[PDB]
Each structure stands twice: as structure tokens, then as C-alpha cells.
Design a protein around this nucleic acid. Structure first.
Length: 85
RNA sequence: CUACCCAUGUCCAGGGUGAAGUUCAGGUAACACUGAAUGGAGGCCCGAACCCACGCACGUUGAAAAGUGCGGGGAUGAGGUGUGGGUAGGGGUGAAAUGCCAAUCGAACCUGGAGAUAGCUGGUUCUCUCCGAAAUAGCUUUAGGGCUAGCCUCAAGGUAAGAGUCUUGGAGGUAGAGCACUGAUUGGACUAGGGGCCCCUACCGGGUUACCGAAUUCAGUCAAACUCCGAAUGCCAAUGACUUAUCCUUGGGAGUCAGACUGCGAGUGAUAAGAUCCGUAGUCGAAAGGGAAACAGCCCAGACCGCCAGCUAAGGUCCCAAAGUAUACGUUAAGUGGAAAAGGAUGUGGAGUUGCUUAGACAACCAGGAUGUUGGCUUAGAAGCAGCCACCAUUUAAAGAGUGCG
RNA sequence: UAGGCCCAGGCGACUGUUUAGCAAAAACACAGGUCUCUGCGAAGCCGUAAGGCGAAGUAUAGGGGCUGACGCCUGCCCGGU
RNA sequence: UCCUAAGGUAGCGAAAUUCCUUGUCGGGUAAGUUCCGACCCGCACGAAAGGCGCAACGAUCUGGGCACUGUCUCAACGAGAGACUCGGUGAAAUUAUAGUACCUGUGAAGAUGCAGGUUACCCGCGACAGGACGGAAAGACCCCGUGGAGCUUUACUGCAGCC
RNA sequence: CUGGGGCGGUCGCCUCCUAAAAGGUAACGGAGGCGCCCAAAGGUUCCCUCAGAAUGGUUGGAAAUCAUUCGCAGAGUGUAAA
RNA sequence: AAGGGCCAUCGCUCAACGGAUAAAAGCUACCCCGGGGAUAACAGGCUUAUCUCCCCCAAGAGUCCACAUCGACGGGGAGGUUUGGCACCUCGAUGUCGGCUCAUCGCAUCCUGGGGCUGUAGUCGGUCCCAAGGGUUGGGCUGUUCGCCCAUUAAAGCGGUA
RNA sequence: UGGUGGCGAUAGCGAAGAGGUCACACCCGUUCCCAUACCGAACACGGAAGUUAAGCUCUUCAGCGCCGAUGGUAGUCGGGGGUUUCCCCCUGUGAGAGUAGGACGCCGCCAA
RNA sequence: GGUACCUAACCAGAAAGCCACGGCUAACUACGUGCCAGCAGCCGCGGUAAUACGUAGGUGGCAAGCGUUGUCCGGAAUUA
RNA sequence: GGGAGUACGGUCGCAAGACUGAAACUCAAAGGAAUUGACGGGGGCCCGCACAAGCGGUGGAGCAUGUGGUUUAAUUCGAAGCAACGCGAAGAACCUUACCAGGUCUUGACAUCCUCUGACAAUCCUAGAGAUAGGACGUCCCCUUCGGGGGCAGAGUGACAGGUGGUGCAUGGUUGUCGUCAGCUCGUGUCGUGAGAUGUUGGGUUAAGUCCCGCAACGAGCGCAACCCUUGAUCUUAGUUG
RNA sequence: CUUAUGACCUGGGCUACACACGUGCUACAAUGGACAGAACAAAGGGCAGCGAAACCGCGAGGUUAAGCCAAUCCCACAAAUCUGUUCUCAGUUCGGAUCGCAGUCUGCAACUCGACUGCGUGAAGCUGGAAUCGCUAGUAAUCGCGGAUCAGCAUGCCGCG
RNA sequence: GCCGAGGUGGUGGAAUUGGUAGACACGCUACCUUGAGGUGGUAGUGCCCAAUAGGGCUUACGGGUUCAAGUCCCGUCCUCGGUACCA
RNA sequence: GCCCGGAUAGCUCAGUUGGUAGAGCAGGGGAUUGAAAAUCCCCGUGUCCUUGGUUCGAUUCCGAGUCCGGGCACCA
RNA sequence: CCCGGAUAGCUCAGUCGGUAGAGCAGGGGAUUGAAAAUCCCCGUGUCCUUGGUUCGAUUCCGAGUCCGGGCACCA
């Protein structure tokens, strides 16, 4: 029945349209106030360091280095050493 | 007798209860009305005779083929009975039960067809000798009955044709075994492909995992309806040999068609039955004797008949109860043997392996019971000790931050 | 030697009758209700005719079925029979 | 919303119907599977197979209370009629022969009789009935017979009778 | 018929397994058929492979059709089974 | 000539299919009669699926602690009362449930005696073990057996024995 | 060498080569007989440029396939016995599997 | 009971409150408040400017008392 | 007034129910006639593109545009039947502009005060997205009888300033709307205890309370129309850039 | 309310879009399409405002520039119409969205987010369901033009024939 | 327990014949109508993707047979109608 | 006198021998109104009774009051 | 064995030789502040197939399916 509460709680992503209360939390190489997003390949947490990949657009993914997606990168210049702050 | 019914006489002790009326008085215009007295109706009441059977008790080879005892319901009417008649069995009759119709009744009674029929049950008498079975198959409104075939006896034949063993020759696909077909199924390697973390992002560009994974091959099992394989036997053979005589044909006559149990081969079941359905083999049935204490069905063995003789089988040999307290070697100690398991067990017997093992073990005695670091957390502490985490290392003859314990 | 009484309850209204000789009632009967047959040689019955029951009767009568005094009541379906 | 020729109205309702059940809820009792009062998820009540309610009635039938009681705890005693005893008369069902112990064990599976043991002098009499599958009735239930008789209707062929 | 009858299920044929390496053998024991169909689906004559897979390819896709190898067999055998 | 045979021949789920007739279904508790333990219910018998009684392995619960107490998924048995299988004796009769009457027998024990462990302070207790000599209440309902209930008692035992 | 038989693939595939003057083959063409559901692919018809590559034969080898012992075992006809869903002992029989091995051809007939 | 009383001496020293304040009914403003908290005998007041709630100021009422309460009569000619 | 002709108790009846007949409770009112109104699937008269008789479109199609919803950091706020929806917007690239993010700033961007001190500026420089800065140079205030005044600037200071913050159910003002529909009242007189009624109704007409007649009413006022413009004819005067 | 609900700047947004709604134009064609010729208005506007003619660009326009503070000059050559030519009934020689490339203007700047050409591309649609809306004579419909508004932008609204 | 029938769009219910539908009605869905309702009028309306075309998915569930299966065949599960008898 | 537990949102109630905290309703948030109801949704919104206390966080663990809830004692 | 039904989409009629007829439905029309129910219009038919008589002939004989009512054979 509390697993059904986990079924009924789908709607906590619904406060992640219309903005969320966010600081500059992913500090981008000492430079603040830049468009970054949390990587869905693997979650950026302070294990190994976290690296921002300059995408073609639509945001910057903080791919959490030691990931199979971040390791096989063509155009390594797009990776940016950023801070977890 | 009884069931109603038809004409006909006949009986019912007493007490209670009191309507319809009636009359009088009152009352009203007058009938309604009212009160007294009278009158006495009633499938009315209580209770005898008299009917009638409800409730127990007694009876039940009874006093009695339905009673008596102590009490009970009707007892002036749908009543009770006496006498004289009526209705007849596939009918009568019935305030109805299928009750009564002569101690009879879901069709009375009596002699008749009639010695009915009965595939059912009981019974079937004098003796020996001669050989002697079956309980299954098919079909059947049959399934406990029957006929044909199977198996037995009697007669006559053709005659050695039969059976057993050895011999060579096959047909056949179980038990077993195999996994090559069929299915089932283990595990690894490998992987098309598939989504998924999802990245870059037109479900489009590709990366990725133990997220799966068809195929793929490597090893691995498994079968009543899986066979590339495939025995023993059992069966049809030819062929001679040996030892045996029994087969077939024709004909008279049958009985048997409910079977049991023990072992192996299966099914049904619960790998339950002294269960059931069969296979092939026994016994019993139809077979006494001896053992299994006694006991159809197991283990021996077939009974013409007599003896106050002899030998063996199964099983027995201390005593019932005939036979060795024989003989050799072991084994149990439980009365196991004389009841049964998973499993538990320093019970013991005989093996084999190998560690320890007089520069001396085992048990026990005496001392050693460390260092880094009395470790530090979660916590108010843990010298491991609410419990981790490095399975660390030198002091030393030797001590693990540890067997444990609290 | 001649009532035991009181509270309720269904079932039968009631007195009556049968299971001679297991079973007396909650069954039958019953008055009343009721639909229907039947115009008189009625219908129905006995049973192949007669004959004289019904009835020396005549729809306010007589057979038959269905229920059961009285009081309140008896609604729906004509497709099948 | 499908289906009917039409979908149960009045009054009753765990009922002489009710399975689950002793339904639940209340009075009766210290305690009440029955009984009464109400409840309706009426398995399967219902209107002349009649529905409900009914004062009077019954050797009906369930339940409760008083009265009084050997019905009972818990038996006792007394009268008499059988019983036993002494003369009189004197049957009957039944009955293989019968000097008939009881434990196990076996067996047509539940012994008086056989086997193993155990105990027991012979013979009556008064009582009890555990047993002889004690007697009386070739089972009334149950299944077969190609039995049988009453009953039944849209089984079959018939017939009477009215058409 | 019947592991007492009742109801329920079945009744003859064909194939398999039980069946015990010949044939046969039962159970209300295990599995499925049949009351046909065909005028070519027979008769002969002569002819020639199949099932998938793997590729290559319009529409075409896992799966139409074309080749193309590898394929004694996995298919096809009027219809159940051996 | 009729009609008959011969031959070819068609009409039947006569399906219960070797087809008794061209043509067929019901109840008996109102019951008979011949038969059967060939064939049931009641009991006996064999077996033990089911049925209570034990145990085995132990994950776990029990603060820790498997083993005071419970013990899952699982295995193995013993008992022959129950629901049942089989149809062996009994259908020329073995009367069947429940109470009353007289009790008898086993022990897996309910009290009483003895003890061991305990999560046994004490008083009660739980649990196995030795014990069958003695006892085991009285009622309302139910035909009751069982069980509920009231009230006690030290205890309100279970199971045979047709 | 060719044609044609018989012998359980011990005759098989599989790979490695060799050979062709004739022989046998592909190979060259459809005018004709005949033809492919469409065709000279095959079947028919006829021809001989070059071709040993294919097949055809001739050799090697054991990689698969195939054949196949001995030894023992399973199971087992009968003989008895024991704790009786099974099992032991004796006489006799005797596989499969697994190997040792054999084998990548033998025997005929006719033409040259 | 030396009580009433009277005589003299003493001090602004000892000593006021509750009720009302929209209309009935004499007397009102300011804050708080926002169908909530609360008033109410009668009509009825408050969903953001409450003279009607609560508070403060200020009035008014009456006084050692004032309001509310339950009674009985009256107004009620509304038992005539 | 409801509770109610109900319950209960009793009589009466064959029953259905009649007759006698309450109460606890609850609202401050339920009803009586009358008047002005509004409505009528009531009547009579009568009007407008209302309907009929026609024309042309909207609803399908793309596209512009407007609000919905939804969507986002925000999609600024208001208008919501006709009488909001090409509307405020007679013009959203920044400006507008409020909204959202970042950068800011705090007598203020803007107004009076008050205290001074002098013109501030202008520019280029580096910043920086820019606001804002820091700077450089350049700061030149006028009018006066010399004190002052007039600004302009900055520095201050508290006053205040500011709000496109909220309520159009506090409001002025402003327009739509019934509709350019034919109506709404007053003064005096009476009428009726009073509310109100007459005048305005009756008759005849009109686009109309237009107007006439009648009339217990006579009158007046706001409305209608008219005078105001435009267009439609002509004359006078005036003729250029006609 | 107040070192913020006030002020300033950048940039975003008011223009989003699965989907309905009003309100407007351009169309679905032969009374049309295409080309050429011919002719005809009213009203309004113009000083950092109009811009002629002229030349150059396929063109939108560029270039320079007369004239005009206006019945003088410019916006402005009106369109429908008329007459020829061609088109022949189909998703086309109608449609003109959507979209690509190449351009021009204004302005600091046209990406979100402007208008207009030049080239291409060429869908939806072949008179639209129930229901509804306007209109009594220069109105119905139809065709162009002017202006406010604005640097820039109209299928919008006024106003004109 | 045994038989007999039947398992469905949001819902009720036909398609029970061999070839594909998931009728038809009622929902529901946007619009039209009304001042907003109910009502009435067109349009679709099984689930899910493609605003389109189309495809997937399916008629309790599970498996077979078929070129096919809501249906054919069989197992499970659910719910109705009938039976559970004689001592 | 004695001891034994609860002293939790606005209200009910979960956290319990140690994870600061939920849930329900109420209430508030705005869309829309005079504001309500209706429709659209949003939000926990707590001196864990205080005083102390071993601290490397405690609503719970401990004492200390207070308080509530108890049952035993104390007969003048 | 006889008798009953073979057309328009459908339900149904219907000539003695010369041909397409109703009703319901389909399609639209007007009608109506909407709606059915009415009110008109055309629609669509080898009159079952095959031969024959005859000038061709639903017409009408020569030749036959399938549904209902019966007499009555059925071993």
C-alpha cells in the first residue's frame, strides 16, 4: 500500500515545470550563472568529479566523469571542468 | 361382521344455562326503546346408562388372533342400536384411510384352465474299477443365463506324423544403453537482435552494461506414446541326431464360462490392500502326508491296499516334541535374535589410510596471557566486547586488536 | 364420588369422521363464498338396448369442480395448453 | 439498459416453509439451538393449491408461571397376586451327536471344539442374562429376474363412449 | 454396461501406447480420428526436387515474389495416427 | 397374365451399431414373489490417503540468546477412535445413533505423588520425564454426541470394549 | 583409358595435386526432328575452333562420416536366499557406450 | 446599657459604583475587528470605513446600590 | 400561524371513517381588501430589417487578428450574455513596458522645502552588457548703489517624494445600454380614512405625450420635432493657383 | 508599501501551441486566368516634410535633384470597366499558403520579432453539417484610393469616390 | 463435487454462421441551441502511437490446430441455471 | 506519604526505549464573485510541558520540579 | 403423393400476344421560432433460368431448386 503511495507520488516532477528554487549550484569553472543541467546518463554527485559538456544547444550536461558516455566523447574540447560548489 | 342406505318401532338418570317470543308496568304522536314477570329454544353445559378408543400401566407360547384395570371425549341429534330387506369383485361402498366387503383388500373367496411359468433356490437314493477338466476368448437387453471355439472322456482310422534337447537359419524392436530424430532440460563461452542508463537528439546520429537475448557451439543430464543401437529368453522353422509316444481326422457324450493366492513382468491406486485388470509359472480348486505352533492358496511331496522293516527331502537335533549339550572359528550381552524408519550415538568386531610419535607426543601440573595502540567509532564508554575496518606486524620460546565470556 | 387453574403462540372457525386390529390430527366433512355445465325426455349417472334413479323435482331447482364460518380482502399476464 | 404474453400490488415475513444458522437485536432464565416481540441479502411466502387478523372451541400442538407432588437426588417399608417350598394335574417354541472352562494366536478375517498355555473334585437348587452371530419371520431396506400387481401422462398400439 | 445401484460418462469402426523384442490379452487405464472425399487427388507415359536458413535486393515489413549457395530430409504425403 | 425366383440393384445413425417388434416413456413410503452377502448401508476385517499423538533438520521469533518457549519451507514415523478406500465373513436377518443401569481396560495424564530445566524472586506458572493405586461435579438449551453457557471443584482427562 | 555390373560409405564427404594425342567431357550453333507454362539452361538437332580449369579418372591424408574388436561392466534365461517401492550369491549368456584398430575401393564383363 | 442621647476637641481627612449610549429610549465618537470572534427583549446588527461586536475617551441613567434572572398583575379593549 | 382536525381516551358503525378533541415543539408572523408596478404558453390596438418575400456572407479551407485554456522565468493588468472577444493599443524589435532574470540604487528618477558652495556641463580615456563608474581636460552664473537677489549645480538634513500597490459594492468625471425608443414628473384644484388616483385616460390621427376633440381638471417643465450642419436648385457679390 | 510594491540598465517576454472560439480578408474559377491597348474619380496629406524629371537596377529601389509652407509642386500613372489576343473545365495557365535561396529599405540593431520585392516551391480547398448574420436605393455586394497611428511596419479601423 | 450455459469498448448487449467487424442503444467527447441549465441538433467516439496515411494491440486467461479462430480444441479462473439420491 | 506513564501542530492523531516529525480535518493561497457555496487547484502551517543533564545531533534515555492519570498505605 | 411463397433496396401486386406497378426505404424539395409524423418529386427491376409455339412474347408451354400444409409408404 505504501508502494502504491510511490505509484501515487508521480507528480513530484510536476513542480519541475514552472521553474524550481535553484542557486548557482553547479559552478562552471569559477564562473557563475550559466545554463547547466543534471545529467540523466548518471547522476552528478561528489564521487568522482563532475564535468560539463558543451552541447550543441538546449543546455549543458554535467556528465559526472567516470561515465561511459563522458569517456567516449568526440570533441573533448566541449568538456569543461566545473565545480560542484 | 362391516361401509353407507331403505321402511320400521325403540331407548337417553338428574342438575345447570337461559335466547326468540309472550304479558304487565314505564316510555314515546305512534313504532323504536326500558324494566319486571312469564316462557322455555340450544349439532348449548356438567355428569350415569349407553356408545367411543386417548394417555400411561398390564398383557404379548396372553383370560383374550386386539382385551381388563385407574382415569378420558360425546351423551336431544350430523346421535346410539334391535328387527326386516337393497347394492358383488375389472365391482360395491366410502363426512376419504386407498379403510371396509366375514380374524383376508393397492383388487375379496372357492373349485376350475393347472403338474401354469420360474434363465431362480432347495432336493436328486447301490458299489468298485478306468482315465479325466475348466472359470478364459468372441457374440448376446446378455453380464450369475445361453451357443459356437478352447481344455476332457468313449469309438474308428490314417499311422509315427507329436513333444523335449542339440544343431544352423531367421522374424521381432522391450530391459538395458544412447541423445544422432523427437520432445524436455542444466551450465558456460559467444551473439544476431531487442529494449533500457540514456548521450549526442527529426524514434533519427551511437555509445553503453553482466538489462535480456534467438541462433551458435563446448560439456551436461532425461523418456509409457525418443530411437542411429540393442541382449537374454520366448515363437514360427528347416535339418539331422538322441530319448521318448502323442498327434490329427470322423462321430456319440459332456461339464466349464463367478475363481483365489505367492514370486517375477506392467497398468489402475497413494509405486496403499489378503484391492482390482492381465501377462507368463506354480500350487489350490479337484491333492491327503511332513515342516511353517495350529493354516486350501508359501516351502518339501503325490495316498491301489497290508507289516511291530530299510533310506533320504523341506525342516529339525536342551526339554515338551523323534534325533549331537557334536566339531572348528568368530560375533554380539540386547533377551537383540523373539517389531519398524529418517536420523541420533567415544557400543563394539575386522580392515585400510596417514598426522602425532625418547633430540619424547596426548591428558594434567608450573610459568608466560606482549608491540604499534588500553584502538575508534554510532554513542554517555568498548583494551574487538551495540559493530565495524586493516585480516596489519615486530617483541618473542610464544600471544589472535582475538577463542570466548559477561 | 363427582372441574386443576392462569399467561400467551401458531394450525384448524366451530359439534362432528376415518387410518375394525400402530397412526383422532394441522387431514376430511361443514355452513357460506364462488366460476361453470343443464329448458325438462335436462345435464350428470348406472352402463350396448329397456326401465324409471335425478324427481310424484323444474334455474330461489339439480349434478360437477375449486376453496372453507364471519370481518378486511381476491392485483398483473390470453403467448403455450 | 437488454428480455418477456406479464414481470409479485395489498397484507404477512428465519415461517408447519430458512440452506449458511443457534442469523443478528431485545424480553422470558443464574444459564434458553426450542418459545414470544421486532429486523429484512423472502436460498424457495403470497392472494379462493387462497392471503392476512380473529372472541368462542379441541384426549391437537409448542412455551412460560402458580398450586401440589417418590418423577428425581436416595431409596425405605407395608399389604396382597405370581415367584421359591409340600401333595394334585401338566404342555410349548426350539432341538446335528455332545463328558460343552478362558486367555491370547490363527482361520470364510468376531471360537465351546483345533494350536499354545492358564486354571478347574462330582452333582443339583435360587437368581442375573455377557455368549452360542441366543429362538420366532428362506429380509421388510438393497440390487438382479428380461419376475408381477396397483398408479401415471404430451411412451406405444388399442377399445368403450360421446362426436 | 457399472469397484452397491441412481444420475453423470460410454456403446461399432481406424491408428498408437500399455503388450512383458512373434501374434493376441483386459480396466469407467493414457492420447486423437471416422459416418468421407476425389472425374484428378485414379490409369500409364515421361519429366524433377523439398523445408528453412544465409545473402543480394522497389513497394517489402518478421514473414509475398526473384535468383544465389548450404542443404538424403527437418517438408510434402486428399484426412487422424503409426 | 398375375406374381415368384435368378442377376444388376436403391430405401434404416436399426448409434444400445450381430440389428429381439413395422411401432415405447414414467413412480411406488401401499407394496408383493422367487433369489443374493455373487452386490451395498451398521459393525467387524486389511490398508492408512485423510485423523490426533510424536519426533528429524534447523531459518527465524524470543533485547541479545536457534534449542525457557515457539518453531516456517521441508523430511521421516507410530497409533487404528474419525472422514474414507477394498467388498472378506454376515441379506434361511448380526435390531442402528443419544441418555438411564453396571462398570471394566489401556496411558499419549485433567487432579493428586515424585522430580529436571526454565525467560523458576516469592505465590502462581510453562515444559518434557517416572507414574494407572484412587477420583473425575450439578444444571439451562439441544433427540442429542460435540459445543456454548451458569455455578463449582483439587480435577472436570482422552480413548476403547459389535 | 572408356562403357557397364555386383559388393553394408571399408565405395562417404573434405582438402591437396596430376592428367588429357585420341577417349570422355565441357565447349560452338538452332537450317532441320523435338523442346522449354518463358528460353537452345536442360531436353533434341547437328558441328569440332580451344579447353584441362569443371566433371571424369590417377595419386597422396584419418579432419568429419563409416567399420570394428579384445578386456570388463550393465541388464539377464534358469538355480536358490534376504532387510521386499528394491536387492544379494552361483551356473550360463552378454550388449550399448568407450576404445586398440581397420579403412579416403574391391571384384567382374566388353572396347581402345 | 454609660446604649440612645447631649457637651466640647480633631482633620478634606474614612468613604461610588454598576447599567445604558442605531430605532423602542435620554445620550457618540476613535481604535480594534472582517459571516469570524461576538451582541440580541423587540425590529434585527458584523463577508474591510460596526454610532448595534470588543476597547478607550466622552456622555446619559440611577445611587448604597445597579443590572440580569424567575414569578405574578398591568399596558393586553389580546376572554371584552 | 404551523404542529392538526393529528395523537390519545371514549361513544357510533358491518367497515371505510365520521363526531367530541388536545400537547410537547416552532416561527414573529402566516392571511384581509386595496394601489402602483413588473410579468402571463390571457385578450385588444400598434411598432422596428424583427419576421415573411430577396440578396450577400459567417460556421468547411488556408492565413491575418482577438480572448480562451494550456504553457513556460514571466506569457503585464483590465473588459465576461446581447451591452467583452480587429477591444482599451489611432500601431508589443529596444524603447512602449507594468511583467521575468541578471546588474543595480536608497531624501530618492521626479516636487517643495530648508543649509551652503560655486555655472554645471561638454568631450574622450579605461572600464563594463549598460545603468553606473573612475578619470583626463575644462567649470565661463548673471543682476545690483558690494550686503544681496535670480537660478542652476552638487553636498547634506529631516520633512516628505513615490507607487501601472489593492477595492469602480467608497467616488468624481467619463462613455455603452435598453433606444433617438414616446415616454418621466411637477404646480394648483379635487378624488380616496390612506397608499395612490386624476392631468398623461376616452374619440380621431401621426414618425412621435404628433395634434385635435371629449374629459374633474386647468396648466407648466424635461423630452419629440424644429432653429445646427451636409447634400440636393437658383440669384447677388467675388474670379486666381480655378 | 518603502535600501522596496520605488527608481535605473541590459536582455527576455507581451508574438508560446496538443486544442476550441469569435472577428476579418485571399480563394475554390470561364461573369474566370494571362498579355496588350484605350479611357474615367472623390476626399485627404506634405518642412529635416514631400520628393518630380532624369539616369541605373528584372524589381522592391538606388542615385542625384527641380518644384512645393501648397486649388501652383509632389504623393497619384487609380482599380474594377472597355476592346483584342490566348486559355478550355482539371486540383489545372485557378489557387497562393507553407517553405528554400537571393535581395531592398528604416533603424544602434529585423535571431526570437518587421514590411516588401526577385527566384523557386506549389498544399489545403472544387461553395462548406446543424444553426446563424447583415441590409429599403446609391443602401446590398463589389473595386481601388486617401489619412490618422508611426523611424519602421494594416487583411485593422476611420474617410473617400 | 459432476454436468449445462456464459466470460467484451465506459455500460448493457447482439456478431456463435468461417474469413478481418469489436452492431445497436446508452454513455463520454468538442461544437450548435438556451441568459447559464436540462433538453434537443450535427460530427466523431475500443484501447495506443502517427494533427494526416498507416501500424501495433487485443473479445476472461493459458496453450494448441489453422493461411486462418470472439467462435475450432484443451487446461486454469470467475459467475449463473440444474443435480448431489437410496439405507 | 508512596511509587509507577502521558505531558506532540489550529484541532484530532503517527512518530517510541535515539533520526526534529507525519497524517486527517480545519484553516490559509489565488482564479470568481458583495463575499460566500459551487467549480480550478496549492500549502503543514510544531516552545515535541518546562528546568537541567552524561554530547560527536535527542520528541523519547536520566534526574529535578510542575502537571495529569492511578492504586496501595497511613482511624485521633 | 398434392397444395402453398421465386421482381424495384425491401415488402408485394398484377393482364385473354406487344409494359415495368403500389407501400416502406433511399435521394432531395418545400413546410415549420426547431423536431418527427405527415405533403410532392424522380428514383432503381432479364418480373428466376433454359428451350419451344410465335412477329418478339413477366405473359407461356417443354425442363428443375428451396421454404410451409397434409393423405400416406419406412425393412
Amino acid at each position: 500500500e505504501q508502494e502504491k503511495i510511490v505509484q501515487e507520488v508521480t507528480g513530484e516532477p510536476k513542480p519541475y515545470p514552472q521553474g524550481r528554487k535553484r542557486e548557482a549550484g553547479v559552478r562552471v569553472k569559477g564562473i557563475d550563472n550559466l545554463l547547466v543541467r543534471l545529467s540523466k546518463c548518471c547522476n552528478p554527485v561528489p564521487g568522482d568529479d563532475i564535468v560539463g559538456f558543451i552541447t550543441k544547444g538546449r543546455g549543458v550536461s554535467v556528465h559526472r566523469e567516470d561515465c561511459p558516455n563522458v569517456k567516449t566523447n568526440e570533441a573533448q574540447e566541449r568538456l569543461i571542468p566545473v565545480e560542484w560548489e
